[PDB]
Amino acid sequence: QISVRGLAGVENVTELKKNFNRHLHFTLVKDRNVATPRDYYFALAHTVRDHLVGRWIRTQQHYYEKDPKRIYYLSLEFYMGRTLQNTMVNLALENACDEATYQLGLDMEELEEIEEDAGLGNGGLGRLAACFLDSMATLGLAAYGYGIRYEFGIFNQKICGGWQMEEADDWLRYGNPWEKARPEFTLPVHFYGRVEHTSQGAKWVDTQVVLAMPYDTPVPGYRNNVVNTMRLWSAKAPNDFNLGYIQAVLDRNLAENISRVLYPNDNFFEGKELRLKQEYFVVAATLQDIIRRFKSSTNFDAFPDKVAIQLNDTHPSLAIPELMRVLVDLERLDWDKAWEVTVKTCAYTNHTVLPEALERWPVHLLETLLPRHLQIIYEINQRFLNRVAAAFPGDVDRLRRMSLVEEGAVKRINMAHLCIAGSHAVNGVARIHSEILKKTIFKDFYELEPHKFQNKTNGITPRRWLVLCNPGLAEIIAERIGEEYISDLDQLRKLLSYVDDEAFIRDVAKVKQENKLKFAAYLEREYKVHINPNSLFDVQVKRIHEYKRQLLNCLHVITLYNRIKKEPNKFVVPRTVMIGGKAAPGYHMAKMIIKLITAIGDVVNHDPVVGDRLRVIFLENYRVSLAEKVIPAADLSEQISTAGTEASGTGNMKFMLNGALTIGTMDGANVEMAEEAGEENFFIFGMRVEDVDRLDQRGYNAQEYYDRIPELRQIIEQLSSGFFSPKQPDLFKDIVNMLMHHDRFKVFADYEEYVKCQERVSALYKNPREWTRMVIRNIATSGKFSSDRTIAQYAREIWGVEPSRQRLPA
Amino acid sequence: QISVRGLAGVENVTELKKNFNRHLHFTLVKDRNVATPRDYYFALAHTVRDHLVGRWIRTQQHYYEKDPKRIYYLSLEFYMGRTLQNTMVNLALENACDEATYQLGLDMEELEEIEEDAGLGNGGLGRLAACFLDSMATLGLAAYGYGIRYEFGIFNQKICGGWQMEEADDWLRYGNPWEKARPEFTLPVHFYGRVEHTSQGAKWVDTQVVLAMPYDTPVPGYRNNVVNTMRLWSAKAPNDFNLGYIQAVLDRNLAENISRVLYPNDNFFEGKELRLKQEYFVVAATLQDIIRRFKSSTNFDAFPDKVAIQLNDTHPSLAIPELMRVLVDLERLDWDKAWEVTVKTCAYTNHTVLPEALERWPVHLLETLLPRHLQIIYEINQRFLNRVAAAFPGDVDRLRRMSLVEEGAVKRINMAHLCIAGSHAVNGVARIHSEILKKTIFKDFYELEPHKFQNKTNGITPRRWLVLCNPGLAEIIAERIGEEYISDLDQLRKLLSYVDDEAFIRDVAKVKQENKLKFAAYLEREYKVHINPNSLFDVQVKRIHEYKRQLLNCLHVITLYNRIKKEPNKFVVPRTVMIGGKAAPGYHMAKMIIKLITAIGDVVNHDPVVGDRLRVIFLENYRVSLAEKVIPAADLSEQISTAGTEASGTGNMKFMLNGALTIGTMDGANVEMAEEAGEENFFIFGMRVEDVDRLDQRGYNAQEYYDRIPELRQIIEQLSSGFFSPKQPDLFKDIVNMLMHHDRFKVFADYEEYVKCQERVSALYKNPREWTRMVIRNIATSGKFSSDRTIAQYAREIWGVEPSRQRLPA
Ligand SMILES: O=c1oc2c(O)c(O)cc3c(=O)oc4c(O)c(O)cc1c4c23
Ligand SMILES: O=c1oc2c(O)c(O)cc3c(=O)oc4c(O)c(O)cc1c4c23
């Protein structure tokens, strides 16, 4: 149908149809008379999968022959979403499959909706890992993603009576056609036990053994015939485990619980034993696999020349003492040599500065679970602090501040300090964040080893986040500038030449209108809720957190409502305000915020005086596949975290690529986005980091804002008095109390500037031509935020490898 | 290579090779350079599976069009063994696959050894279900096997220091290519809750829900293109189950434990709650599936014309009150009509008379777990006893004896009494067993309803138990009489014409020698143990139980040893005595018996005076695939249960078909075997049932035998004094004590006759020609013991359907 979706040659279409029918018959054991649409989805998935396998085998064979340096990306989260369309895009099969299925009497878009998301992540950090795998394959790197195959990913969110309910995400129920179990490469992982000292060093003995069984998923590059591997570990009990009889068999679940469920915490540390087991499990199985692959090529001097290990946050930080354990206890290298190898192999990416997110494991936990690793951590600490003492003699407070061991009520290990000591590179995820790391939380470490500290600004893959989710926009762009931008996003800069082109203006605006109608239709059919498609689509989608300030958005919504009620017959730009995202099940305030959003909706959406001028929708079950629908439909992107709290953001970049304008603070990657587009083409408001610091030194007093802003006072009075909860007048007392007395994120301090900035948005939206021109300026300068740029920087500045755009033979 | 293994046409061989390479590449994602022999096994399995699917789809389509009466065989056990070779045999693919794999540079026999047994049964009852599925498919019946997909089947048995150790049988570790998950036909099963009475009858409410997910395995008939289904249920928690968050997800295992593990009890009732859950789970999911299939054709009058339900033992007895529950509570039929339908639908097979095997469930268990079923059982009981009272007025003891409710310390439900009341047919499994049922344990029921009581003598499938495991014997038979006997075993009677044929005598004896050499080679390569292939192979393989009297065999072994030690330079016929079988983990006496066998081996096998004249081997991990190896190698089959205890036996029949002579008591099917072959062609010894009864009335006194038989006294003195356990002299005190003071099975009473009978065996073995002639007379009269005969009798006399030998189109 459309050019970016590839060729539909008669030979290819015929072959796809034959293979579809073969899988339906032989693989699924169905005929056309009994087949459900789910069976048709599976027949298509297996047909497309067949096209991957040749390239997958040849890619891995190629890496064996050429022996390049291998990149190992260690993450506890891979937020993959659906695989079918992404695979078709990267293999240039989309139009052919569309044609083949049409001829079989089927709608491919309908079949695509049947696939479950691989929801093996929480939010930004998890989705970053997924975008990165796509870029690494596209750039021809010998890269492997290593993680856990969770049986249950991020919970499915249902809204009942305005409240979040959690349901198990049983994503493997119907099978996963993309994975290949590899039980032949099963590896043992050890837990508990004790340390024995011989004349030949330490021995870790009397351990409990859990098996790690790998499952491999293909990761296709964009049209280069490269197919890399994501290897995810599943926990299995040994067959003599606990071996009255019946109970011993049932107790196998105790071992296998390690890979059962993703911890649903986003930017929050929960110090639970099962989480620690997951962290060690992924690390121990991965490192054995790495060493096995290295040895098939006892000289560990060349180890850092053949292996890079990237730690996604501190979650796999145990890689550092585990590598030391293997090199020293098993391979019998001396400490200093092993340490040199370790440091040169490992690199660490920090994702947040929020104190409650930092992993600080109780010593007593590590002592029981991982007694040898604790000894190694103590030894690392002693040697590191000796270096600190020599560099800064007599500075006793620095010693205390930099220690990997934290003193207190409970002794803890600071995993971030372990990662810095044991890595040759430490990076933040946006320029402002990397600067904050050097100035504040890691200042001491930066003074000791300035060379370790880098920036690598986050990015997103333009495959999933443009071509896949917004084919209409990808096409109108391709018509003018060709197809090369899909793997070289900087080429979007050529679009600045069309900012005064009347044909292009009309096409950009038409693509947006079509996306909005399609999403408006989606909401009716699937959620029985009506929206006006002519309204400004005002969208905030991301995990629910106090720092992200969904509450500030709520205050604006209520302000707009109060202004309409005060002057009903005055013209206002119509808005659909959409907020979506999950709260961690134990995060009470975030759960209260969701209830507030729905309660506001209950009032606003049913008030006849408002009409269709304002609508407030909570988008249920926000996840990757929902993002692919809502982002192309958005006019306004809400990126309103308190300055200095959102390390980068990536949702911000997705909206910019897809033709929404941004209202945002100077936080995270927003700063770089505004710098790329021009500040005049962005809706910037609020305190800068420096303003927040100044307010903190003086002391934040919320009462002052309440006293001075009559519109703010009225909202607080409405909240307190039960206006939004008539049957439970004090329902929102916790929210009011937090805002008035202990708001860490200074919601009130940005309220006035935010409301005023929102008026400027409404003014611009009244002039469609000028709105669209600003949109064009945003799309045209979004090139920097491709994860291809990010990965090329990691490859050159951290991993010491050259990216390649060259095709492997088909 | 050999004719019974089918054609190896050039077209077929070429096609098999192409498909093998396709599966290796696309299915397994391997090339020839990285492929293990396990990968080659899987490539072959998928290739053969492809040939089933067309016939499977067409068979099920055929049953939809024709709408025949459907047979539902309900069993908690399906002891299937391996599937690859059986599938090739039934599809006439064996030679072609052999050729195709040879050409690819592979040994097919080696690949066959890689397949795990589907060990979803304990012994006789489980293997009977498997033989039956094979016969039902071969006879063209519209039959479905329904059971549980256990994650762990019967434990793997290891022998450590002479003791049984149990290991989890993780048979699904590498995947199962034969099954097809059918998550689309998932059904809810209810547990716990309470009964509510409305104006519209009873309601079962506040239940806990567990999902039943079916997996279908194809069951191919012998060369008739019929492929039936075995449907096995897996337990799944609902997604809102227990829905802090993490724990609620982990607690899903509580529901899914239902299908986790097979109870390893053979002919022994253990009244555990989890076992009861398994029994209801299979019944509730199966009956919903039955009713769904029936309705796709509210007139339940025709229900018994379209449905037969066969209960394999009392394990699925809850089918009776469950059918009543559905018909009365859900479909709103009146009681009497529902009861008529139920009785006409259900039939019950009894497998043992041993009191400790009978299921007698505590009322308090049923009250908590299944409150509505208990109410229904009480109502059945009241109405049944009203009929008893009317037929036998004033006979108050009969009322007590026949009640489904047992009075006592704990009130219990007798499941056998429930099955008789609720079935139109009740059968035993051999003529003597069916007579014992009428005379003793079910005498009262037989007097009330004589017409219900039938015999159906057990059988075995000649596909697995001749063609598959003994191709050499199948071939020499086919050379003389053709191939028709494979599905018409009565034709073996034609072999009586060759009893004086010198060529045939030599061929029969040669096939046995070849089988013995192959098994002798197997024992060395796999278990590092040497045996003399010229010795008489004396084999007792079956579950370890006191009733089966492995102990009597032990006494004979020790007697032979003592006789050699007394007269070393006297000639004796050399023997290899092989005993194998598993003991239930909690069965202490059976575990002690295994230890005795190995301890005897330790003495006998290392005594230089004995030489290679006597060897005692315990065959580890006896299971279906081991049976297929050892049975063709046997000379003498030990079938030595106390008269009246072994209901039928089926191992006995397997040995007869494969050219072993039988030493046995007049018990179970041994009686019919001796009747078929002629008593002169059998080695019969010992008490008859009548002799056991006489001894019981007088009182069994073991001391008497000890006092009168000096050879017996010496063995007991050796056991007591530590001769077979020098480092633990009293190790076998439990065994000695049981034999002397509380032997339920009268081991000593048969000792003298058994030893004398064994001398007659040794005498005949000295004359190879006459041994082989007797063998021919056994093989030639084994036809009655085909499960095809058994199933034809079930079909005609119980299910009311006609078997068909006619082929479906290919
Ligand atoms: O008790 C909690 O307090 C919190 C906070 O005070 C906060 O600011 C953020 C969070 C957060 O992100 O995730 C959480 C969880 O997954 C959880 O199980 C418990 C809590 C939080 C939490
Ligand atoms: O405690 C037991 O006593 C038994 C007997 O006394 C017996 O004659 C036969 C048996 C038997 O066959 O299986 C068993 C089990 O699976 C189990 O867990 C416990 C027992 C038995 C058992």
Ligand SMILES: *Cc1c(COP(=O)(O)O)cnc(C)c1O
């Ligand atoms: C991109 C993305 C995120 C991250 O969004 P931010 O606004 O950067 O927090 C979270 N969840 C999903 C499903 C995403 O696609």
Ligand SMILES: *Cc1c(COP(=O)(O)O)cnc(C)c1O
């Ligand atoms: C046939 C068979 C049995 C039953 O043997 P009996 O001697 O009749 O008890 C038990 N186990 C296996 C593995 C079998 O093949």
